[PDB]
Each structure stands twice: as structure tokens, then as C-alpha cells.
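Loading example: each entry is read as eight labelled lines plus one structure line.
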Amino acid sequence: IKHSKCRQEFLERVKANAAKRAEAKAQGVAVQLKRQPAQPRESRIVSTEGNVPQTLAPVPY
Amino acid sequence: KSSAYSSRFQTPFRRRREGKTDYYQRKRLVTQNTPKYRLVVRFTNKDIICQIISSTITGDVVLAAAYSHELPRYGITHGLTNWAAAYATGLLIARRTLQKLGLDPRPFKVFLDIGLQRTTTGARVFGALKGASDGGLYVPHSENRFPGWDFETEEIDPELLRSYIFGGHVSQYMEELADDDEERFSELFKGYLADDIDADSLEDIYTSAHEAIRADPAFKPTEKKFTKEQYAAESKKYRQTKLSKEERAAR
Amino acid sequence: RDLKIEKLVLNISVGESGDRLTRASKVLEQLSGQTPVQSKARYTVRTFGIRRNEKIAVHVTVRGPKAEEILERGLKVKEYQLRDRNFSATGNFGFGIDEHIDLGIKYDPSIGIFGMDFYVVMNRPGARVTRRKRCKGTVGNSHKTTKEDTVSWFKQKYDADVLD
Amino acid sequence: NHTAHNQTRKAHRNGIKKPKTYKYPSLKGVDPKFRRNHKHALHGTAKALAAAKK
Amino acid sequence: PRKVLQLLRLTRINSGTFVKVTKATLELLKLIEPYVAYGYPSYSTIRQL
RNA sequence: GGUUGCGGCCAUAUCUACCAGAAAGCACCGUUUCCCGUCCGAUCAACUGUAGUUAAGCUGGUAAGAGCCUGACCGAGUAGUGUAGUGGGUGACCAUACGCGAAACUCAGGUGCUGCAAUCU
RNA sequence: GAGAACAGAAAUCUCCAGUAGAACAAAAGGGUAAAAGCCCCCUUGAUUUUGAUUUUCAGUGUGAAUACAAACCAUGAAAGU
RNA sequence: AAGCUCGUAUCAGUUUUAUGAGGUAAAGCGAAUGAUUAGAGGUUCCGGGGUCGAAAUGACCUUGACCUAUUCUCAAACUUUAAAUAUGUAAGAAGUCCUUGUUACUUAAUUGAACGUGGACAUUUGAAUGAAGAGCUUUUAGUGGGCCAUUUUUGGUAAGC
């Protein structure tokens, strides 16, 4: 009475995993084919030469 | 009509709003992983369209097509909308779709699609059915709506049904206008008088025509006129353009 | 885009069923040349002596050139004068005549006297676009007739003025 | 009269296990026209793997 | 919260485990917030534990 | 690129108003012997593409139109809510900590896309 | 809404607008516009054999229902039902 | 309780990613529906009913058949849109691909379907975290009068209701 996406989407991830093991078999390199959750993000130098930061001064009322 | 009225109601389907397709009938035909083939026969003014159409969610696929305007290649040049040329087109697709499958392996079977034409006995629609069933397709049918079926008894006349295949109701009607009221006979049938085709020879023309159809159904295309791109240029002369906002803002 | 008469509808409304329904049914048959059709009542009002589905009244429809004789012979009873309104916004007109012997008949003491309603519908060519089954459509405003266009047409032929 | 108190804590003592989804599910309830063909389909391919490949 | 406190092996009171920070484990700490006290440890405390 | 046959998604495709459409194609229109169906050849049937037409149909363009559909540091991190305290208040209910997060509205932009077969200055 | 002898608040006929404001044996809520409404045409599948499944449930009964298989049929040009 | 077949089995009162389902809170009423309290007159525009009657030109009665030209205000049994919390499913070895065997089903067609032979794919083999082993069977005791709290609530003015 219905049809469901998630399994057909799971099938496409198996197809992409098929190609990655084929390429790494050609040129010797790790596959790293497992998925990972989101990581804590890295360090970055941020310089605001365009825009000096401004005070907010929580006045309103 | 009020504003809340037009906000409320949903439209029908586009192919339902335009009155062409009956969606109650289509659901029975399409839904019968094997492609399911269907004989679509339509009758407009001056034309016969007979197509074998499968089904796909992309929307449709046509296997073969026969048209009325290909009949002058086969020797029928006059009276293209009548019952007998509809029989000749029904023969025509049956030889055509069979050669490309190489069957000319139980039978090949097709289902008849009418459209919206009302089923009356003696209709021109089922002449396309009778042609395909004589041609070699498995088109399932019964002898109800063929011409020559008595409403009183459960019998058929094969002599009258042979006659309508070979232009019987036309060439007999040439005989009633020849002896009576030439002024009617001068107006109609004027292509017959210029080609000097008398009435008895009309049965000879259809008989040679079915021999011509079974000879070469391989459908050479018409050559064409100028190109696609030459034809695309003249069509751009008539069609207008859209208007931009800044052209419409100052307006 | 000419202004041809589509059909002529001849109607008679009788309160009772019996001989009087069947006698007037013979009148419209011999006049129009066609066997008429009868209509049954929808519901009961009891002020009129009727019940549901009683075949209360007859009518008959005529098309073509045979209808134009019946109009031209009928409208002479009205002496080439309509009244002022008589016209739809759509474009059509009707007029009711008493005393069917005015258009002449053998006297028929068995059949007797009946009052026939007339009604005319007007359309231009191209009206098959509505009435057909495949690819049904609506007629545009420039081809929809008018109340105006019936006034111009009827004043021209049959030589009448409308009135008032 | 009726209350569903303590009824969740009773069922979650032995847990809620799955019906463990065997290989080769039972063909009772599968369409009998398919079952009648699939009887003969396994019969030929056991004969064909007996004499030919050995 | 009681299932999550077992999955991080925090059985009894005043027990402690290291937890790798991902998007997945951060939501596990988000459920058990009224019961745990956590922070980012230095090289000194891990050596002493 | 324009039409035709069969469609998919089913208003960005509807609705109302005017305006245009060379070509081919659809359409209106011509007739009533046969098949057939009516009160009525108007629908439906057959016959002719011959006598006539773009007036409609349909196709396209426009309207500070109605509607619809996408966008928004728009409404608004507001409403509402999960969890927490020996927090406040006589209560009604309200603050704070860790979380999730709307809607109408407002404004901007849009007005069918497309699959197969065929035919066309 | 606009028109038609008697004819009017309501008879019959005509046309335009008309997303369901009607009708579907009955309570209420769902469902339905070339139909599941309305009017006609032919009919008995409201049949035979007994299994499988869903609802209340101990996954026992009873009632009600769903999808097939083997027979014979009804309708339709046909797919089907 | 007695144990049995085995010993990383694949499971979990949990999250994440990828998709499903829902129609309460809030929003909406110049986007349909929508009560309520009270009702003034309409003798063939009804007749639902009651007693009567040697009949049907038949009386006597009652709820009234009818709202006839009224307004404004909402809702647990009104809706276009629609959070939170809870909820279904998937994250692979029984899986993926290549080659062609079986059949009395299916197709115009060895085309499909279903199950396979032979070959390839290896420990990051297909998210996180945990696992005082996992799987399974027999057999039997007691119990089948429950109460309290926070939050969401129905009846009751309000109850240690």
C-alpha cells in the first residue's frame, strides 16, 4: 500500500562502497570505508581586518 | 466567483481537464515485470491513427504505428476515413509489428483500446480490430459488434461482412447516385470521377491493396521537408516573447 | 458567424392525466410530424391535483427547416408582435398562444381546445464544441450571442418590432 | 477497576526479544501456484547436480 | 537516563570513565546531565588516575 | 521550433478579461443509401474531404487582477514544550539552568515542466 | 439567475453559472463527479471443495472481513470485475 | 529450581545518520462549517399522532406541519498550517557483483521469477557505546482487595472526593 525509500538508499551506499575498494586495490591505499559521526571542529586563525567587533550593550528596556 | 471559492477547489488532471483520456478505463488496461501491450486506435477527421503502446512510469513507449496517409503508397488514394480503409490499417499494423519481432512463439497478443468512442454495432472502430485479428495478432473479441450481426438471432452474415471489407456500402451507394440525381453525384465522389474509377473496380482496388500490405510493411519514412532547423526558424516568426519586469514597470 | 435557429420546442402543460393528456399528445404529433415525448412530475404539491411521476404533460422538439414553418405560422397568431422583454440574457425567446385552431385544424369535438407553449433557442455555428463528448469546451464571450443580438436579428427578418 | 500501572515494569524483566528470522521461511501461506512450480524446480536441480557435476 | 548510565559503565556513585567526544556521545551526556559532572582533563590528572 | 496521438508529475498547469495565430495538423462545417440511435442525423452512427471557414475550439501573449507554488539575519529564537532545584509567590502563576523549536502574517521572486512515436517553411 | 397561455411562494419547458452545498435503505464519522449518484441493458458469484490471514485475543472460540488456489458460470467488443 | 546444545554468539528500557507515520499544544476566524437562552402570529403550503364513529363532505384534539423579512458572540462532538515528547524501519557474509544451470509457473521470446552450481570480494566487512556469556526447554510455588507523589486530565461549586 506503500513503498519505502531508506532501503533503496541503503543500496546506493553499497554501490559506492563497491567502487572504493576497487580503486584502493589498484593503487595501494587504505579504504576507510566506515562512516563517522560529526567531529569537534578544528582550530582556525580568524582576523577581522574587514570588520571591527561591536558592543551589544544589553539595554533594551 | 468568490475569492475563497477558487482557493478551495482542486483541479482535475490535465489529461482529464482536456477531455481526452478516461482515467477509469486506463487503470484497467495498464495494470495488467512484463510490458503490457495495447492497441490504441483513434479516428479524427481525415485520418486513421493505430499504435501499439506499452506502459512505463516515464509515461509510454510506442512499438509501431500505421497512419492513413501511408495508404496512397499502398494504392488507396480516396476515402481514407471509411470502414474499409480502417480494415486495411488494421491489417497494416499486424504485419508491421510482427516483422520486427520476426514471427512472420504462441501468438503475439494485443489488447484493444478505444478511447471515448461509443460502442455501437457496425462501428468503424472494430474494423481495425478485424484487420489485426486477420493479420496475425491475438486480439481477443466476439462477433457482436461486427456489421451483419442480427439483434434478433445469434448469427452473423459473412457475406455482408466480406462486402464491407471490400467497399460494399460505398460502391453500392455510387450506384444509387449514378442512376438518380447526378447533381449529388457530381459533388461527392469527385476524386473518383477525375481518376475515372467506376464502382465495380473499387472492389478490385481493395483486393490488390491487402496483397500490397502483406508485400512490404517495412515503413519507409517520408523523406522530409527542409530540415528541423529550417522548420524551427519559420516557427519562431509567429511565436511571441515574454516581457521583462523593467519593461512592465514603466508600462 | 451567422445566427441560425437551433431547435423549436413545443410544450403543453396539462394538470391532469387521462384522455386530456393523450388527446393533446395527438395534437403535437400531427402538427410536428413527430411522435412526442412525455414528462413525469417530480413531486407532489396537492394544490394542483398531482402526484409524483404521473406523466403530467407532453412536449415535442423540432429542428431544421421544418421548425421554421411552425414558427412563421405560429407567430402570425401573435400578429407579428412580441412583448418587450421575452428574451433571455443568453439570447432565446418563447411565446405562448391560446386557441390552437387559430393556426387552423379540423374542429375535433373529441379533442377540443388546447393552449400550446412555444420556445425558440438561438445559437451560432460552432456549437458542437459544447455538445460533443471528446474534448468538450466552452464557448467564448465574443461568440456567445447576447440579448442584444436577438433584438437585431428578430427585428430584421419576420418584419416585426419587438415592442415598448 | 483497570489500571496499567506496573505493567511495563513486568514485561521488561525478561525483555522484548525478536522472533529470530530463520533461513528458509515456511512456504505455508505463499501462493499455491508458486508452491506447485517450486516443488518441481528444486527436484530437477538436485538431479542435475548429481550426475553432471560430481 | 538509567540505561545511558549503564552504557557508559557508570555503575556506582563516584565512578568515572573517559568518553570520546563525538556528535553521538555528546547527546548521551545531554540526557544524563542532572547526574554527572564532567570536564576536559589535562595531562596531569590522567597520569595521576 | 509549431501542431497531432498516447501519457507521467497533477493549478508554476486553475479562474476572469481582452489581443494575436504564415505553415502543416486538429477543429467548425457538407450530406442521410447502407450499419445504428433518438421525441428531434443536435449528441451517437455511416458517407465525403468534395461546397465553405479561423468566428469559435485549441495554442500563445498581456493584466500594479483573484488564486497557487517556491524563498526569507520577515514574523521570531517569540509562542509552545522535554528535563532540573529545600528557586520566587498566600495563591493565580512567573523567573533562571540544560535542550528542541512553530504558525498565520510581511516582503521578495515565479506562472507548467517533460517521456515515446510521427508530421511540418 | 434569466425567459415561456392559464402558471402564482412551488407543475412543464429552455439556457447560462454551478467542487458536490445533493443522493447513496438506516446512527455517526469517513468515501464518491465521463462515479460508488441518476436512468436504462443483460443476469444470479447471495454458487462448489475445504485450507491461509486480519480484528477482539490466552494470539482458543463465535461473529464480521481481507488476499489466493481448484471447479463451473454471469456480464463486456475488451482489459477486467 | 533442575538443567540442556554451544561458547562471541548477535542482542539492547540509549544516542546518531537516512527516511516513514500522527493531527493534541500553539497559531487561524475580514480561509467553510458553528451552537446556545428566549418566540410573536401563519385551519386543505401536513396529518406525526389520540379517542371516536353501520363512514367519510370527518368530527374532536395535540407536537405542530411552516421561521415566513432579524442581528452578535464560539466550541471537547469546527478546520488550511502545524512543534515538543513518545514511535516504525534500515546501518550487510543469510550481503554485493560477474558467468550460466533447474521448472509442469510466467513471457511473443529462456524473457522473467524462485533456488542454485562455479569464480571474485577479507578484517575499518560497511555509524557510536555497552555486553558478570548467548541461545533454548521442562516444571511448579505464591499473587489475582493495592495505596502515595509530581506533571497531563474527565465528573463534582469544592473534598484526606
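The two ends of chain E are 26 Å apart (CA to CA).
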